[PDB]
From a paper:
In plants, HGA is a key intermediate in the biosynthesis of tocopherols and plastoquinones, which are essential compounds for the photosynthesis. Inhibition of the enzyme results in foliage bleaching of plants and eventually death, and thus HPPD inhibitors have been developed as herbicides for many years. Each monomeric unit consists of nine α-helices and sixteen β-strands that form two barrel-shaped structural domains: a conserved C-terminal domain containing the active site and a diversified N-terminal loop domain.
The crystals belong to space group P 21 and comprise four molecules per asymmetric unit, which consists of two homodimers ( and ). Electron density for a ligand chelating with the metal ion was only seen in molecular A. The structure of HPPA can be built into the density map. Similarly, in HPPD-HPPA complex, the α-ketoglutarate moiety of HPPA in a bidentate interaction results in an octahedral coordination geometry involving the facial triad. In addition to chelation with metal ion, the phenolic hydroxyl of HPPA forms a hydrogen bond with the side chain of Asn423 on the C-terminal α-helix (α9). A 75° horizontal rotation, the benzene ring of HPPA shapes a T-π interaction with Phe381 and a weak hydrophobic interaction with the surrounding residues (such as Leu368 and Leu427, in ), leading to the current orientation of the aromatic moiety of HPPA. Besides, Gln293 underwent a conformation change during the binding of HPPA. On the basis of the structural comparison, the remarkable characteristic of inactive state is the H-bond network formed by Glu394-Gln379-Asn423, whereas the key feature for the active state is the formation of the H-bond network by Ser267-Asn282-Gln307-Gln293.
Numbering used by the authors:
A (entry chain A): 29 to 106, 114 to 191, 202 to 211, 216 to 254, 263 to 285, 291 to 403, 411 to 437
B (entry chain B): 30 to 108, 116 to 193, 202 to 211, 215 to 253, 263 to 284, 289 to 403, 411 to 434
The structure:
Amino acid sequence: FSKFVRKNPKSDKFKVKRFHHIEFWCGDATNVARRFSWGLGMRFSAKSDLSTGNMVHASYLLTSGDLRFLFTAPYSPSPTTTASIPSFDHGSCRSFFSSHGLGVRAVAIEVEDAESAFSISVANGAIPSSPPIVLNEAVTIAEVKLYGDVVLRYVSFLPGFERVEDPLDYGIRRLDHAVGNVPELGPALTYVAGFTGFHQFAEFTSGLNSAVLASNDEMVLLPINEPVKSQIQTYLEHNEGAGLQHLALMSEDIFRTLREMRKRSSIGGFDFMPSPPPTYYQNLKKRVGDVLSDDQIKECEELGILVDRDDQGTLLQIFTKPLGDRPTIFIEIIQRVGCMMYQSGGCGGFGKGNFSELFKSIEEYEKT
Amino acid sequence: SKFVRKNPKSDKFKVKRFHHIEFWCGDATNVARRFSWGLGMRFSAKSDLSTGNMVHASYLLTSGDLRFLFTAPYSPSLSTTASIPSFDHGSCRSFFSSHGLGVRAVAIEVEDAESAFSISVANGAIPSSPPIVLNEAVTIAEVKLYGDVVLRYVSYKFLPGFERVEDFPLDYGIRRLDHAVGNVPELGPALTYVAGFTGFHQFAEFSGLNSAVLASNDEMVLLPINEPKRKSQIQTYLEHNEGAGLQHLALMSEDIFRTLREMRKRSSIGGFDFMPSPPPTYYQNLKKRVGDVLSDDQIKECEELGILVDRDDQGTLLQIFTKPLGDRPTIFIEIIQRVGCMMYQSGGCGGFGKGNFSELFKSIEEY
Ligand SMILES: O=C(O)[C@@H](O)Cc1ccc(O)cc1
Ligand SMILES: [Fe+3]
Ligand SMILES: [Fe+3]
């Protein structure tokens, strides 16, 4: 008596593969990358600083599976020849951090040819941010504006980077989707999907309007939020315009990651949102009992994990507190169940039907 | 044969001890949460949006009597609510844009800050912030020290506007700040300047740099200053810091082996890294110059943890240095434990490590 029909026109104007990395623009990349490495459990993989000859910026790379988190901070200007990332600008980086604080600068995706995906994007309305530049005849990097001061980066770690050698792993394996807030969803949705050809990923159905753009294989998901009390309007005010709201980090085992990330919340890691009331986890039997066992439900309660369902699969998720000083960007840890055939992207939705379940649990909790 | 140390006790105002150190950051949350894990300091007070402050976010880390403050500016679009009246968004942004992560204020507790500020300015000090009484309880004044670092005065002893943080806690053994060392291009002018308005006397000592230690009457507030074989790290400091600034802080510890076992264990998982260890010959000779102080097992612990041991006419100093704290090879941290001079412990017991360069060079050529 219910069926959800999802369509996929596969209208990608250029060949998009997978997410490549995320580049946080910092004021001091060392302390940001070392805190992220201890909280998320990511390994110090590569570096491009003074110890590698880079006299322009200190970029450090953290990895946990297919996830790459880059942390870039500008050196004192006292010619960016030794710079490994040619799109980096000292004036831009200082202005970005003074206007937005700690946050994501680049959302990088791997493409077949960055030079073509750049020209096709601009030919379809994309604002150019960095022209196609070939790195040592091996890698090509191009950047166009996504929203606000965040850029969409095309890659087809990097030259100039040196590997770091000499266990830090909590279960995070890849980046699922990067969500950004904009003042008006409409113009931002037609703009981004207007130069990538990304189709809308429908969700099965609070102060927000969300729409999910996705590539053909739907592994590159880009939800965008708009404020309708609203958490988004507070984000726009504190971030001084449109920016990335949160990053969803796929975990091989969300229970492993959550126990690893909660032991360290008070000793350098990350803090989480208030856990759902107990009646929320007394209602999981009549919701995902056929997916999660009774003991795995006890794990979600002890770890404060949100569990939502969809037409295809089940989504286990939780959110952290803001990563920096500003109540702006935070991190989402998810684990998707089902759609195995390789797992389909967006399996289980994103959590649209979770505000209704939290409202129902809070109204239930009370009165008891 | 005999070393003679003199103390004129010429403090132009009553000074007690170090109060706190305020780092100016780009993001105070990630820097403090990194410092809290590497050094083992407790989240004690906060002055951010959760307290009503829409101007900046200040977080205090404590370890015994040591207090590290971490201040980062909010966006001016939030528009009075600042608990630290000397804070300026443009100054904090321009400071960090010029020097990066570093020390802004070296706060010392005095008897009266309205006097410490006026007497200082009347004796050559460059004023940074006039005396401001906070909620009729705390008075804060600031005068320039060297570079963009300010010497902050705290009168009646975290601060009004801060909320205590509750919630076993972290503690690696660090208990107090020993001395705050700064690098300047010319030691001479900066010496007659700082001592010109403080009256701090020169602390006598028992490389590429020249050092001079200014100290208060009881010699608990120590402020060594450095000036620029191979090229000295002082000149490399001035280039990457864009002028004079604080070089390092010496964090005294009840047990340097406890603190180092905690700090080295976490160097690769978010903590702080240390300088390369001395060769084994340095610790084979560590029982001929310091054997009446350290036992055989305690000498073995220094070799395992890479600690340097120096000695002077009064006491013995066990010390070790960390790698630079941020992206720039500028600010770093020293862990110190002093033995001897017990009569309460005298300030500067064992010196500051001026003789370690000679014993290290003697140890490298022995290996
Ligand atoms: O990225 C997104 O749009 C979703 O992650 C948002 C979301 C997810 C779960 C939830 O309970 C509320 C909002
Ligand atoms: Fe999400
Ligand atoms: Fe020292």
